[PDB]
Symmetry: D2
Subunit: 127 residues, 4 copies
């Protein structure tokens, strides 16, 4: 069931890989925003990837209602810390969530200094 | 491309490909913005891809000064036209331009219903 | 420790995602080959992805010795079963394994009818 | 491209890009093979990328009949030249050509030390 600001079925998970080192991307900062009624972007959640390159517990089933969400990935900080001057300021993922009921979302991203790819895996909830 | 203040000596080019059909992505709309003092996004250029999946003559070299730019691609419309329910609201590319100062950029986007990848090719004005 | 033809630390794992449906790629066949002394490709292991789009237990630490390995992914069968006529016959991953001691390898692949991407995550063994 | 029996009306083109430096991948060697009766791979064409990361004039339309082709890219040499230890031995693209019969193909490869992606653009000879 729901929860309220932590980690229901884990309705939203993010995974990041580094294509240069062949490893999980660790300590990568991320901010999530939701489009508010007035049409602006409101802060929703933030965190950093673990040593496994994942970010879990951003929200709960109860709190993750229908709307348009934006996941901002701080790729620039990550490359600079390694001595590389990257092309993008950050990577962005914008999507509509739960318009036909609750779903679980896994966002995956693969990073290179001059290129990034993002994909999503969507599942119909629990079994 | 002619020139002057915005559109075609072509310091900025965009190419879009479709990974489902294996062809150029045609009639794809896009808007270009420039970050202003206030941190908001100012309108700069726009167009739609040609039959070869390309967009040229967006700007000119005199107009295209050092700044942070955002390319927003209407991928959602593209897939809805083909009768497919896509995941992303749109695709965004945010980057810092010039550095050496004036420079030539190629932005490529590869689209799939639940995924997208983008790369930049930066060329030699520079020295 | 080792084992002998099943599943040590799980020295080799494969994960496949479908970019068209936004889901794990299930029932995807794969064959692994190792380059023999005589320079030919010898059968090493085979299996099919689970409902989670993963293939575990292909070998053990003991059996996965130094060499050049080839992972053949049967992408053509997978698309045909969905009614799509894809471009590639199959996808191939060729690499040298354990030349500086035992490592754990995760091979990930993202599929589209006309495009595929593959990446690897390599780890230094157990903790 | 001239023509005759193999090399340049250009039914087959290959483009290679570097995701680490954001530029065309130059001087990349590649071999093209055609599957014969015996199921072994017969030599068909070869070359290395130009300063724009492209290879044209591999074959001619008369020579390029329906069959299964394999493009093998020496990515390993490319990275070793730049002082980087790559994961793959090489990159391979295996596909069936013609169907409508005669047709025009563009194969693009995006390279990273531990990752690679490939897409095909197929054009209209066909009808």
């Amino acid at each position: 069931g729901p929860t309220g600001t932590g980690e229901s079925k884990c309705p939203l998970m993010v995974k990041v890989l580094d294509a240069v080192r062949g490893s999980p991307a660790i300590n990568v900062a991320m901010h999530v925003f939701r489009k508010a009624a007035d049409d602006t972007w409101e802060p929703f959640a933030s965190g950093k990837t673990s040593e496994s390159g994942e970010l879990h517990g951003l929200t709960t089933e109860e709190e993750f209602v229908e709307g348009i969400y934006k996941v901002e990935i701080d790729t620039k900080s990550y490359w600079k810390a390694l001595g590389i001057s990257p092309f993008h300021e950050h990577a962005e993922v914008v999507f509509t969530a739960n318009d036909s009921g609750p779903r679980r979302y896994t966002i995956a991203a693969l990073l290179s200094p001059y290129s990034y790819s993002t994909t999503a895996v969507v599942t119909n909830p629990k079994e």
